[model samples]
Target: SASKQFHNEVLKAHNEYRQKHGVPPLKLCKDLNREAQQYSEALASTRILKASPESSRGQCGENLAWASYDQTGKEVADRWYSAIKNYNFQQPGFTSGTKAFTAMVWKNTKKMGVGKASASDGSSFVVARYFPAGGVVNEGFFEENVLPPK
Candidate 1:
């Protein structure tokens, strides 16, 4: 389970970036948090970076981060946002390594979940889930939702 403090930090960082892109703020969902936590635990156990099958059902969008040591919420969030370098504003699409960046700033998403866990070897995994998802592969979806920063 993620600590309350970590939850707040992650949410803070998420909304901070979302605002820059003109996206609405995201509220934390308890059910989604639990779902994310479960997957984080699974990831920590395997020390692997694989998307959960549930993430592909179009119900949610997921972003994951792993570290040899524990990671701070702000640090994790900034790492994902760094993908902006690879994102092309002129023709926004699901290209490059923008999965986390696109999902983090998706305009239509209203809620999110956050989770963090540590493995026996002290490695850590952080998982974030967005409701109504983002980075949707539908025609014009990415261009419309993943807005560039103002």
Candidate 2:
């Protein structure tokens, strides 16, 4: 599983980074690594599934609703991609530099709607969408509610 692989790789690198920095290991463990990865995955998934404005267009909305209703593989893949790119884990230092995080983001970004957003403000739109309450989770709203009805 990518999550397990992510756990191992992150643990190895984090430990090495600590050693090289001459800093005591934060004692960051494998469980922490995996939990972080899973949390990030959930964040990305929710972002793409709910946030992208492109998915709200009349045609796009109809398509999304039908896709979700029918469980279309292509649409599902696209939606997943959108969410991956939108994942809140990304930042200058916290996540952007990690291979594990990048790989995980890329792996999920390959899904269809993940990167369909045409507008690029170079800002964290996904972060805002997913973390409107200034938290990781959505608070309570479902993905279906985040988006408009078809």
Candidate 3:
């Protein structure tokens, strides 16, 4: 169910982002739940254990559904690796252009985590976290109309 929760969090974040930017709202992915479930199963099939407290805490301020590829076999690690890669913003509405964006998810526990969305133009970004009990916490919003120097 963690994957399902993560999928929902993604939708929530996407909608909020669109509203903030005045972009037309997009429909949720019909197969988002299914895709998330598959990704979760793929990661579990590898039997990848959770990451250490120090590692997890630094990344998400929690210690739960974290895993490291180094602790898994090549095939298993690859499965875990591919899970996140395959769960990204590859939907029909997401296209390469001036107003494009990217969303990334971090699973903190079986049912808790956070996500970040960044505009392609490097103008703005949003970070949000979710918990089973507290739901989503909009962490921060940053807008930089000017891109940083290389």
Candidate 4:
């Protein structure tokens, strides 16, 4: 149903980014992976890019990506990580457009899931879930969780 290549590749990208951000790498959670895969299929069939209603808020964070063509894992990961460009490291936390970047490098995040689905039109949808949803908007939480690389 899903490509193993994409799974590992995306994980590779994530771990590599986390490494650069000075956060511990995430280990794949079996349940989260399954949930992400199912959600990805849901988006593919409907061509929607919203999170699933059943998703547990606060406890799990998610990132969604859509592409007109089948997207490779590294491509999707790079796109998400690219949000760092808009992130304000000096005043970082939950900013307007850097959710994905924050989620990817959250220090407290320890487990993750990855999924990608394709539509009949050859479009692709990617879903990533992070456990315990790291990026708290509370004061000082960002300073503790998302750190600038040394």
Judging by lDDT against the true structure, name the best candidate.
1
lDDT of 3 by residue, 73-117 (tens): 222222222333332232322212211132222212123232222
- Model 1 weakest lDDT span, ten residues long: 49-58
Candidate 1 residues lying further than 4 Å off, grouped into runs, are: 55-58
lDDT of 1 at 139: 80
Give the root-mean-square deviation of each candidate in angstroms. 1.8, 17.3, 17.4, 1.7
- Top candidate on TM-score is 1
lDDT of 3 at 84: 31
User: How much is the lDDT of residue 91 in candidate 4?
Assistant: 84
State the lDDT at 51 in candidate 3.
29
Q: Once model 4 is optimally superposed onto the true structure by TM-score, how far is the C-alpha of residue 50 displaced, in angstroms?
A: 1.9
For model 4, how does the per-residue alpha-carbon lDDT over 9-115 read when each residue is reduced to its tens digit? 88899999999988899988878888888889999998877877643534888989998998988998898999888887788678758888999999999998888
- RMSD, candidate 1, Å: 1.8
Better of 2 and 4 by TM-score: 4
Task: Please give the ranking of all candidate structures by TM-score, highest first, separated by commas.
Answer: 1, 4, 3, 2
Instruction: Single out the weakest 10-residue window by summed lDDT for candidate 3.
Output: 140-149
Instruction: List clashing residue pairs in candidate 1.
Output: none
What tens digits encode model 2's per-residue C-alpha lDDT throughout 23-106? 333233343333333333443445454322433221211012112122222332233334334333322222222322222222
How high is each candidate's TM-score? Answer: 0.93, 0.27, 0.29, 0.92
Q: Model 3: clashing residue pairs?
A: none
